[PDB]
Each structure stands twice: as C-alpha cells, then as structure tokens.
Amino acid sequence: SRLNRESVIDAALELLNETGIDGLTTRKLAQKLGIEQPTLYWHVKNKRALLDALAVEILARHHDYSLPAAGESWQSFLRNNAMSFRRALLRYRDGAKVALGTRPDEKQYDTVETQLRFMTENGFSLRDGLYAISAVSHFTLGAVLEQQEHTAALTNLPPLLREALQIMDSDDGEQAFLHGLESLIRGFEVQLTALLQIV
Amino acid sequence: SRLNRESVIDAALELLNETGIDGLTTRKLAQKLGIEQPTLYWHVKNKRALLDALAVEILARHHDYSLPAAGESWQSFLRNNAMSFRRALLRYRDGAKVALGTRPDEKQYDTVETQLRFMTENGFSLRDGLYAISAVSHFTLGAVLEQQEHTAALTNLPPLLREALQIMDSDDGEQAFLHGLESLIRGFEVQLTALLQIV
Ligand SMILES: CN(C)[C@@H]1C(O)=C(C(N)=O)C(=O)[C@@]2(O)C(O)=C3C(=O)c4c(O)cccc4[C@@](C)(O)[C@H]3C[C@@H]12
Ligand SMILES: CN(C)[C@@H]1C(O)=C(C(N)=O)C(=O)[C@@]2(O)C(O)=C3C(=O)c4c(O)cccc4[C@@](C)(O)[C@H]3C[C@@H]12
Ligand SMILES: [Cl-]
Ligand SMILES: [Cl-]
Ligand SMILES: [Cl-]
Ligand SMILES: [Cl-]
Numbered sequence A, B: 001s002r003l004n005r006e007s008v009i010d011a012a013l014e015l016l017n018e019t020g021i022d023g024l025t026t027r028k029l030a031q032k033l034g035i036e037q038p039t040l041y042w043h044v045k046n047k048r049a050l051l052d053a054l055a056v057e058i059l060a061r062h063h064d065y066s067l068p069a070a071g072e073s074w075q076s077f078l079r080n081n082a083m084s085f086r087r088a089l090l091r092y093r094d095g096a097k098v099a100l101g102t103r104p105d106e107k108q109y110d111t112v113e114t115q116l117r118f119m120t121e122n123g124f125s126l127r128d129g130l131y132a133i134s135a136v137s138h139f140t141l142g143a144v145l146e147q148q149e150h151t152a153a154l155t156n157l158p159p160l161l162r163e164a165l166q167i168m169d170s171d172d173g174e175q176a177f178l179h180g181l182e183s184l185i186r187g188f189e190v191q192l193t194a195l196l197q198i199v
C-alpha cells in the first residue's frame, strides 16, 4: 500500500495498538503494509527511527493544548497542558513508553520555545520553569505508564491495602492523577512566590 | 549452575543489566545459567513471572528507606522514601520499566500497610494518603524512566531550548528530581492543612 511518511506512521500506530511496543517490529510493519522487508527499509531504517517518529506524531495528532490561551495563568496552562498530554499518551497502547526519553523534534521547536518563554514571562527562571515543566511531564508519564503496564500485566491482604487496591481498581487513574497534579502546581506556586524568603 | 530462587534472580538481574528489559529473555537466561530451556521452565515459567520477581527483589535488595523513623514527619518520610526508591530503580538497567504496573507482593504487605497506616496517623484520609504516595511513586518512576530511556536512545535550536537542553545534559536528573519532589511534598501539605477550607 502507500509508503509516504504519513501512511507508514498510520500503519505503525495501528500495529502499536494491536501488539504494544515490545511486540512492534519492522517485519510485522512490512506485513501490515503488504510489502517486503527491503522495501520497508528504504522508508524506515530501524525500530528506533519509528519510535522517535511515533512519539512526535502521537502528540501532533492528539495533544491539542500545547500552547497557553491569551491571558492564561501559568497554573491553568500547566493543568490544561498536562491533561492534554495524558490523553494523548493514553490514546495508543504503550503510548507513554513510546514517548519516554525522546527530545524535542525540530517540528516542535517553535512550540516548546513558546512554553519555556511563557514560564519565564511569569516570573520563573528558565531553570525553575524547566524543573516545573519536567516535573509535570514526569508525574504524567509515570501515572500513565503505571496505568497502562498494569493492564499489560493483567494479560490475606491487610485492611488498608485491601481498601487502597479497591480505591485504585475503582477508577482508571484520572482521579489520583488530577489530585497529584493540583498538589504539584501549588507546590510550584509556593516556590515561585517565596523568591529569596526561607520557605 | 545453582537454580534456587535466589540464584535465578541474581542471574536475571545480571542479564537485565547487560541486555535491558526488551532484550531479557528466558532463552538468554538459560544460556547465562548454563542450562537447557526445559530445565529453566521448571523454575521460571515465563518472562512475566521473572519481571514480577525482579521488581520485588530490586527493592528488597536496594530500597532501604521503606519505613519511617521513630517520630519522623510524614514530609521527611516521603522525601527519604522517594530518594531510596529512585536509587533502587536506577541500580539496574531498565529497573523502572521492571517496576512498572506491579502490585504489592505478599512479602511487602507488612511494609506497605505500615506506610498507609502512617499517613492516616498523620491526618490523611486513606484516599488522600494513597494519592500522595501514588503521586510520589509516579513522579519518581517517570523521572527515572526518562533518564534511563534517554540513555537507551543515545545507543538551529532556539535559545531557551538550547539552554534547557544544556541544563538537562549537565546533570544526571537528580537536581530536577529533588526540586520537583519538594514542590510535590509542599502541595500535599497545603492540601492536608486546608481541611474543609477553600484553598
Ligand atoms: C509539559 N508538557 C507535557 C510539555 C509539552 O506540552 C510538550 C508538547 N509537545 O507540547 C512536550 O514536548 C513535553 O511533553 C516534553 O516532552 C518536553 C521535553 O521532552 C523536553 C525535553 O526533553 C528537554 C527540554 C525541553 C523539553 C520540553 C520543554 O519540550 C518539554 C515540554 C513537555
Ligand atoms: C512511595 N514509595 C515509592 C512506596 C514504597 O516505598 C514501596 C516499597 N516497597 O517500600 C512500594 O511498594 C511503592 O513503591 C509502590 O510500588 C506502591 C504501589 O505499587 C502500591 C500499589 O500499586 C497499590 C496500592 C498500594 C501501593 C503501595 C502503598 O504499596 C505503594 C508504595 C510505594
Ligand atoms: Cl495504496
Ligand atoms: Cl508509496
Ligand atoms: Cl524490529
Ligand atoms: Cl553451581
């Protein structure tokens, strides 16, 4: 079938959904695409190239709150950005695993530069803004990965743990995520406010 | 060589370090152990059983701050617990990937019950204590996974991003981690303090 970049990526996401990350392979991608393996190699050199591309494209397709609204607070932007990031990572099987350890792509440069500038224009040093952005990224990735890999795994408890497991089993993870997110955002705010005060 | 549980686990961690998680296999474990594959199967049924075991044993061996000190504050316990958790996850290649989505093992029941009880004895509802514990777990896992998978990957920047990448490349990740951790802990504290007040 068609082997332009857009089409190869569509097929790879479809396969990622069916097989997960560890099961995703170029041989299986060639099969899905109805092509021989040397044909594929012309377009896709290895699994890493594919993974890097999929991490960019998953956000390009499903991460719709990458930029703050006009007049939006930094707190609100981090909240909205994190919810959007989480949704995007949850959309394909092992999506968060595909996103791990990637670095900004050239096609994302304008966008993440704006993100970083925004934090600095709200009083953060680049480092402190970066640390806030990174903590949000990390917390969100961890929460999605635990949620997803828990599912992968599924394929005389003491009382508080029993109840804790009931609590976790009662929700997809969004409740704990949204709660932890408010804690994180407010902690950043306390830090930012304090300036040189002992806090 | 010897195939008791302890020995199989030693070999599997050694192999995890050499090959990472996706490359870890029972065939390769059998090779390391100097045994045939049906011999191994008697002791280890599949890769999942091995992964579940390794997640328990990595913490058993290297997570030394699982319990609060006498009179220790909940803030200090979460801090100390998180640093210890992070160190443990960093000790083997893809350690954090091995830990993902696991649930408490029977051998950890006493310990995590104590953790949960401790939070409740400091004023948290079980749910809020759980949400705090989970946010710490998630933030720490995400930060370790990004650090580690970044390394795996390695095998006209705009100015703020250039500097941000210099900042990240200058440290192993501990600085941003410790900073984000204080933000998280203080956010929990603000929440706990507020009780029914609008906050
Ligand atoms: C907070 N939120 C989840 C962010 C986001 O919305 C992104 C996006 N594509 O819109 C990221 O790329 C974002 O998710 C993300 O992945 C970010 C990063 O990876 C980095 C890295 O690795 C190094 C320097 C700077 C960044 C960053 C500023 O681009 C990060 C922004 C992250
Ligand atoms: C915060 N810190 C990293 C904790 C920890 O020190 C643990 C340990 N072995 O000592 C965990 O097991 C700990 O790391 C961890 O993994 C915990 C959990 O997985 C769960 C799950 O999944 C469900 C209910 C309860 C727990 C928990 C209370 O046992 C969690 C405690 C985590
Ligand atoms: Cl076609
Ligand atoms: Cl074509
Ligand atoms: Cl492959
Ligand atoms: Cl021996």
Ligand SMILES: [Cl-]
Pocket (backbone or CB within 6 Å): B001, B002, B003, B004
């Ligand atoms: Cl033996």
Ligand SMILES: [Cl-]
Pocket (backbone or CB within 6 Å): B024, B025, B026, B027, B046, B047
């Ligand atoms: Cl295997």
Ligand SMILES: [Mg+2]
Pocket (backbone or CB within 6 Å): A099, A101, A102, A103, A137
């Ligand atoms: Mg990233």
Ligand SMILES: [Mg+2]
Pocket (backbone or CB within 6 Å): B099, B101, B102, B103, B137
């Ligand atoms: Mg866990």
